[PDB]
């Protein structure tokens, strides 16, 4: 396909996903809401192959991963569980949310700490 | 002059195994405080360029701290210290240093451009965690470091060019005085004051012959506390030999001779 | 909720604001890279706008771009021939060299053209 879409006007297309990067830092919930206000969600990571561009991302950024201490594992805002062997989760700060960092790492951060965030629209 | 320097000194903290959101970078220029940067803003102890870069470096250091094993209960610190110099020959040095709970464990400079750790068992162990951390990151080439060196020096040059750094000598004021007039002898003290830079030579001389360091009494070099220093040297002479004693000072490539005033 | 399409762009490349971009892991000198870009009616990364190419601020590591020294002036120009728009890039002296690696944000490090590095190709649409 010479053509990539469909995507919001000034967004990044890579393999029929859309991505935007927001400089203006916000806590985990404020970020979720900013994503929701563009029929979008926080970055979900489902494939090393379809999202290999993510290896080239500088610094760290909120993604839709959230701890569920009842069973003791991670899930996305939409509800699906963490495909094992996708992310390595590193304990950094004490919290129940995770910053994505290159390459396919999640750092655990306190949900209240303002950070940059990445929104994604999927297929 | 002695060389123009620039230092970045970035600190991240862990409390009971948890990396604190905050960090602090303190920029110093030719030794003198210049910027302090928290997560939010840089302030002069507008600075976007510095806030953009120094915040980034901060985040990057929170992660590296996370990859350190056995983070013993309580507070520990990781610092990334960057110092570059431009000498009078226009030759340049640069160093990156990592300090854990204030002890060096890893060092890169521009002449070797190799990483080199102490012999300290804890050091080798900390360097291990961190270099194994840098191995994994497919995107941490030898270039990443050669660029940190180059960056430091480009900033230092930017700061020189725009006259943020002044390289002005202040030649000393000198006063000689008579004192401790007692048992037919007198003390003569020669005080140097207000001067920069620090290095200075200041001796008593009987008949142009400079006196042994053991026949005189020397003040320390104290900061005046307005950027400059002061010091002194005195010696004990017989009354009415005072016209054979002179204080000799070398400073900022002046040489000068001050006699005992009548 | 205005839905757009991005193209035309090579298969599985990155589209953003009427430009196409790819990253190549397989490291090559400046000329080898120019030629690899030319072999997909593409060029090495040209930087003309901080607004239209703001995604470049998020780029990890260092990568060849089409900037080339012109030693008479001191000044830089792109493969295609247009000059470096001043106040776009900060040029950092790294190696004594006549080619530059792009790094985030809108920086170029001067590198020896012969040194193998990863590269970024860019197309118009």
From Swiss-Prot, chain B:
Cite the Ig-like C1-type domain residue spans from the record: 172-261
Q: What is the effect of changing residue 15 to G?
A: In allele MICA*002, allele MICA*011, allele MICA*013, allele MICA*014, allele MICA*015, allele MICA*017, allele MICA*020, allele MICA*022, allele MICA*023, allele MICA*030, allele MICA*034, allele MICA*035, allele MICA*036, allele MICA*041, allele MICA*044, allele MICA*046, allele MICA*047, allele MICA*052, allele MICA*053 and allele MICA*055
Swapping residue 198 to R leads to an effect described as: In allele MICA*004, allele MICA*005, allele MICA*006, allele MICA*008, allele MICA*009, allele MICA*010, allele MICA*016, allele MICA*019, allele MICA*022, allele MICA*024, allele MICA*027, allele MICA*033, allele MICA*034, allele MICA*035, allele MICA*037, allele MICA*038, allele MICA*039, allele MICA*042, allele MICA*044, allele MICA*048, allele MICA*049, allele MICA*053, allele MICA*054 and allele MICA*056
Q: What is the effect of changing residue 209 to L?
A: In allele MICA*016 and allele MICA*039
**Phenotype for residue 256 to G:** In allele MICA*054
Please give the residue ranges for the topological domain Extracellular. 2-262
Provide GO CC annotations from the record.
cell surface; cytoplasm; external side of plasma membrane; extracellular space; plasma membrane
Induction note:
By heat shock, by infection with human cytomegalovirus (HCMV), human adenovirus 5, M.tuberculosis and diarrheagenic E.coli, and by exposure to DNA damaging conditions such as high doses of ionizing radiation, chromatin-modifying treatments and inhibitors of DNA replication. The HCMV UL142 protein causes down-regulation of the full-length protein but not of the truncated MICA*008 allele.
- Name the source's superkingdom: Eukaryota
Q: How is it modified after translation?
A: N-glycosylated. Glycosylation is not essential for interaction with KLRK1/NKG2D but enhances complex formation. Proteolytically cleaved and released from the cell surface of tumor cells which impairs KLRK1/NKG2D expression and T-cell activation.
Outcome of swapping residue 79 to R: In allele MICA*017
Q: What is the effect of changing residue 144 to L?
A: In allele MICA*012, allele MICA*032 and allele MICA*043
Topology within the bilayer: Single-pass type I membrane protein
Q: Which UniProt keywords apply?
A: Adaptive immunity, Cell membrane, Cytolysis, Cytoplasm, Disulfide bond, Glycoprotein, Host-virus interaction, Immunity, Immunoglobulin domain, Lipoprotein, Membrane, Palmitate, Signal, Transmembrane, Transmembrane helix, Ubl conjugation
Q: In which tissues is it expressed?
A: Widely expressed with the exception of the central nervous system where it is absent. Expressed predominantly in gastric epithelium and also in monocytes, keratinocytes, endothelial cells, fibroblasts and in the outer layer of Hassal's corpuscles within the medulla of normal thymus. In skin, expressed mainly in the keratin layers, basal cells, ducts and follicles. Also expressed in many, but not all, epithelial tumors of lung, breast, kidney, ovary, prostate and colon. In thyomas, overexpressed in cortical and medullar epithelial cells.
What mutagenesis or variant effect is reported for residue 196 to C? In allele MICA*046
Tell me which species this is from: Homo sapiens
UniProtKB/Swiss-Prot annotation, chain C:
Q: What is this protein called?
A: NKG2-D type II integral membrane protein
List GO terms (cellular component aspect).
cell surface; external side of plasma membrane; membrane; plasma membrane
Q: Which organism is it from?
A: Homo sapiens (Human)
Q: Where in the cell is it found?
A: Cell membrane
List other remarks. Is not capable of signal transduction by itself, but operates through the adapter protein HCST. Some families of ligands for human and mouse KLRK1 receptors have been characterized being very similar in structure and highly likely to be orthologs. In humans, an additional distinct subfamily of ligands (MICA and MICB) differs structurally, having an extra MHC alpha 3-like domain.
General function of this protein: Functions as an activating and costimulatory receptor involved in immunosurveillance upon binding to various cellular stress-inducible ligands displayed at the surface of autologous tumor cells and virus-infected cells. Provides both stimulatory and costimulatory innate immune responses on activated killer (NK) cells, leading to cytotoxic activity. Acts as a costimulatory receptor for T-cell receptor (TCR) in CD8(+) T-cell-mediated adaptive immune responses by amplifying T-cell activation. Stimulates perforin-mediated elimination of ligand-expressing tumor cells.
For this chain, one GO molecular function annotation is:
identical protein binding
Where does the C-type lectin domain start and stop, copy by copy? 8-123
Induction remarks: Up-regulated by interleukin IL15 in primary NK cells.
The top of its lineage is:
Eukaryota, Metazoa, Chordata, Craniata, Vertebrata
How is expression of this protein distributed across tissues? Answer: Expressed in natural killer (NK) cells, CD8(+) alpha-beta and gamma-delta T-cells. Expressed on essentially all CD56+CD3- NK cells from freshly isolated PBMC. Expressed in interferon-producing killer dendritic cells (IKDCs).
Q: List the disulfide bonds.
A: 6-15, 9-20, 37-121, 99-113
The glycosylation sites are 41, 73, 112
Name the gene for this chain: KLRK1
What range of the intact protein is shown?
Answer: 91 to 215 of 216
Q: What's the protein's topology in the membrane?
A: Single-pass type II membrane protein
Any one biological process term the GO annotation gives:
natural killer cell mediated cytotoxicity
- Hey, which stretches end up on the Extracellular side? 1-125
Q: Provide this UniProt record's keywords sorted from A to Z.
A: Adaptive immunity, Cell membrane, Differentiation, Disulfide bond, Glycoprotein, Immunity, Innate immunity, Lectin, Membrane, Receptor, Signal-anchor, Transmembrane, Transmembrane helix
Q: How does it assemble?
A: Homodimer; disulfide-linked. Heterohexamer composed of two subunits of KLRK1 and four subunits of HCST/DAP10. Interacts (via transmembrane domain) with HCST/DAP10 (via transmembrane domain); the interaction is required for KLRK1 NK cell surface and induces NK cell-mediated cytotoxicity. Does not interact with TYROBP. Interacts with CEACAM1; recruits PTPN6 that dephosphorylates VAV1.
